[PDB]
Each structure stands twice: as structure tokens, then as C-alpha cells.
Amino acid sequence: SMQEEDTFRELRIFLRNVTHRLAIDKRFRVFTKPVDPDEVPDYRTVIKEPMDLSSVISKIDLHKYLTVKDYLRDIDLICSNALEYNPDRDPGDRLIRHRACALRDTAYAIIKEELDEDFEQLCEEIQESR
Ligand SMILES: COC(=O)N1C[C@@H]2C[C@@H]3O[C@]2(Cc2nccnc23)C1
């Protein structure tokens, strides 16, 4: 229905706004573009599904997310990729792990405060009907 297409358009507006607020935070600059395969050629041998905030906006605009749950699976993949690629005790690995955990915690905190639980349930019920 037109009402259901209006529901998904409101979800995309919400997701673009959350993603922009994460992308302008200086702590999260390393997560804003894909890891350069020229400068880090081993990255795509270890990490089987790369993800970054520029790819997330492209996916919102391609209508890939029909729920906030499917958006949060990609925020979780950005964080888990950083923890698995950078697991060592040295300061550069510990700094990127702390920033990855902060990106995840910040996204979940904005959604807990600003997403109505009945708007998410409506998106889940339209998705399940398709
Ligand atoms: C989410 O970003 C990451 O997981 N990484 C790991 C890479 C390794 C290291 O820092 C990255 C980029 C880079 N470029 C040149 C030399 N070394 C590095 C960013």
C-alpha cells in the first residue's frame, strides 16, 4: 500500500540521520570509507564481508534495509570486522578496538532513545507479509 511505502520512507530518513551523526564524529573517521585494498592487501583475505559507513548510506538508498534490526546487523559487522582484523595488545590495535566498541554502543544508544518500539514492530510486520 502507499501507507506501507510511506512507513519505509520514514525508516530511510531516520537511518540516514543516525548514520550521518556517526560519520561526522572524529573518533569514527577510520570507519567512514572502505579499507584501501592497495595500502592493505591482506585485508580482504582475512575479512570476508567488508563494511563501512559510506557503504551503509549507499545500502539505505538502494532500499536494502526494511527494519532497524537489519541496519544494526551492518553496524555490528563494522565492529566485529575491526575486532577480528586488529586483535593484538599493541596500542594501535587497542585504539581501533575501543573506537569500534564506541561506534556500536553509540548507534544502539541513539536508537534506544529515538526509535519508537511500535514503529520498529510495524516495519517487522510489513517485512514478514512480503
Ligand atoms: C577499520 O579499519 C581497519 O580495520 N584498519 C586496519 C588497517 C591497517 C592499518 O590501519 C588500517 C588502514 C592502514 N593503512 C596503512 C597501514 N596500516 C593500516 C584501518
Curated annotation (Swiss-Prot):
Which residue windows are coiled coil?
Answer: 108-130
**Residue ranges of the Bromo domain?**
3-114
Q: In which tissues is it expressed?
A: Highly expressed in estrogen receptor positive breast tumors and in osteosarcoma tumors.
Domain of life of the organism encoding this protein:
Eukaryota
User: What triggers expression?
Assistant: Up-regulated in breast, uterus, colon, ovary, and stomach tumors. Induced in breast cancer cells overexpressing NCOA3 or treated with estrogen. Down-regulated in 5-fluorouracil-resistant derivatives of the colon cancer cell line HCT 116.
- Cystine bridges: none
Q: Where in the cell is it found?
A: Nucleus
Q: So what family is this one in?
A: Belongs to the AAA ATPase family.
- Assembly and interaction partners: Interacts with ESR1 and NCOA3 and these interactions are enhanced by estradiol. Interacts with acetylated lysine residues on histone H1.4, H2A, H2B and H3 (in vitro).
**According to its UniProt entry, what is the function of this protein?**
May be a transcriptional coactivator of the nuclear receptor ESR1 required to induce the expression of a subset of estradiol target genes, such as CCND1, MYC and E2F1. May play a role in the recruitment or occupancy of CREBBP at some ESR1 target gene promoters. May be required for histone hyperacetylation. Involved in the estrogen-induced cell proliferation and cell cycle progression of breast cancer cells.
Q: Under which name does UniProt file this protein?
A: ATPase family AAA domain-containing protein 2
